[PDB]
Design an enzyme around this catalytic site. Structure first.
Site, short mmCIF file in Angstrom:
data_model
loop_
_atom_site.label_atom_id
_atom_site.label_comp_id
_atom_site.label_asym_id
_atom_site.label_seq_id
_atom_site.Cartn_x
_atom_site.Cartn_y
_atom_site.Cartn_z
N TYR A 85 20.54 -6.15 36.09
CA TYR A 85 21.57 -6.34 37.11
C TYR A 85 21.19 -5.83 38.50
O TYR A 85 22.06 -5.86 39.38
CB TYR A 85 22.88 -5.65 36.68
CG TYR A 85 23.57 -6.26 35.48
CD1 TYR A 85 24.34 -7.41 35.61
CD2 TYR A 85 23.46 -5.68 34.23
CE1 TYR A 85 24.98 -7.97 34.52
CE2 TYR A 85 24.10 -6.23 33.13
CZ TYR A 85 24.85 -7.37 33.28
OH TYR A 85 25.48 -7.92 32.19
N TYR B 232 25.59 0.27 19.76
CA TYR B 232 25.07 0.61 21.07
C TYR B 232 26.01 1.58 21.78
O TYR B 232 27.16 1.79 21.39
CB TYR B 232 24.86 -0.65 21.92
CG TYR B 232 26.12 -1.41 22.29
CD1 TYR B 232 26.63 -2.40 21.46
CD2 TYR B 232 26.78 -1.17 23.49
CE1 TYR B 232 27.77 -3.10 21.80
CE2 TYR B 232 27.91 -1.86 23.84
CZ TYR B 232 28.40 -2.83 22.99
OH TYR B 232 29.53 -3.53 23.34
N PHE C 75 29.83 3.91 30.46
CA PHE C 75 30.49 2.68 30.85
C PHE C 75 30.73 1.73 29.69
O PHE C 75 31.49 0.77 29.87
CB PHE C 75 29.68 1.95 31.94
CG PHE C 75 28.32 1.50 31.50
CD1 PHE C 75 27.23 2.35 31.60
CD2 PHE C 75 28.11 0.21 31.02
CE1 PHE C 75 25.98 1.95 31.21
CE2 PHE C 75 26.85 -0.20 30.62
CZ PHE C 75 25.79 0.67 30.72
N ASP C 76 30.12 1.94 28.54
CA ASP C 76 30.27 1.01 27.43
C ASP C 76 29.96 1.74 26.13
O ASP C 76 29.07 2.58 26.09
CB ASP C 76 29.35 -0.20 27.60
CG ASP C 76 29.76 -1.38 26.74
OD1 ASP C 76 30.77 -1.27 26.02
OD2 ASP C 76 29.08 -2.42 26.81
N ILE D 187 20.92 -9.02 27.72
CA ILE D 187 20.05 -8.86 28.88
C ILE D 187 18.61 -8.65 28.42
O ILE D 187 18.36 -8.39 27.24
CB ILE D 187 20.53 -7.69 29.75
CG1 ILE D 187 20.57 -6.42 28.90
CG2 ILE D 187 21.90 -7.98 30.33
CD1 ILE D 187 20.84 -5.16 29.66
N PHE E 253 20.51 3.54 27.43
CA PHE E 253 21.22 3.09 26.24
C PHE E 253 20.90 3.97 25.05
O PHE E 253 19.75 4.39 24.86
CB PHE E 253 20.87 1.66 25.90
CG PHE E 253 21.37 0.67 26.90
CD1 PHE E 253 22.67 0.21 26.84
CD2 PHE E 253 20.53 0.20 27.90
CE1 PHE E 253 23.14 -0.70 27.77
CE2 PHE E 253 20.99 -0.72 28.82
CZ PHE E 253 22.29 -1.17 28.76
#
Length: 107
Positions: free
Chosen positions: A82, A26, A36-37, A56, A99
């Site tokens: 979120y 991912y 962010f990831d 999620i 994503f």
């Protein structure tokens, strides 16, 4: 709401099911924002399963709508992950998530 825009190659028939442990490269992305990831950073590609609500909701339905070798592009609504709460310091409230997901799994 889950929207899929598939980069083509793969098989298109091996679908993820319940009781199956899957491996995902991912990559997080913020709409009009920076990353962010990333699982590409740690290079341990996040072994997880389906059916325990560990992920999620927006990432959950996007896992089942893919197949082996494919490369999709998620589009997560705020209310499924979120957007009411906001993850502390990392994801602000009312955030729409992007994503980059590649499914190279087992089982």
């Amino acid at each position: 709401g889950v929207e899929i825009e598939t980069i083509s190659p793969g098989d298109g028939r091996t679908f993820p099911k319940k009781g199956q442990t899957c491996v995902v490269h991912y990559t997080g992305m913020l709409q009009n924002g920076k990353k962010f990831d990333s699982s590409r950073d740690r290079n341990k590609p996040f072994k997880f399963r389906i059916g325990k609500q560990e992920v999620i909701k927006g990432f959950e339905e996007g896992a089942a709508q893919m197949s082996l070798g494919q490369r999709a592009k998620l589009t997560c609504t705020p209310d499924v992950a979120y957007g009411a709460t906001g993850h502390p310091g990392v994801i602000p409230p009312n955030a729409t998530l992007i994503f980059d997901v590649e499914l190279l799994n087992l089982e």
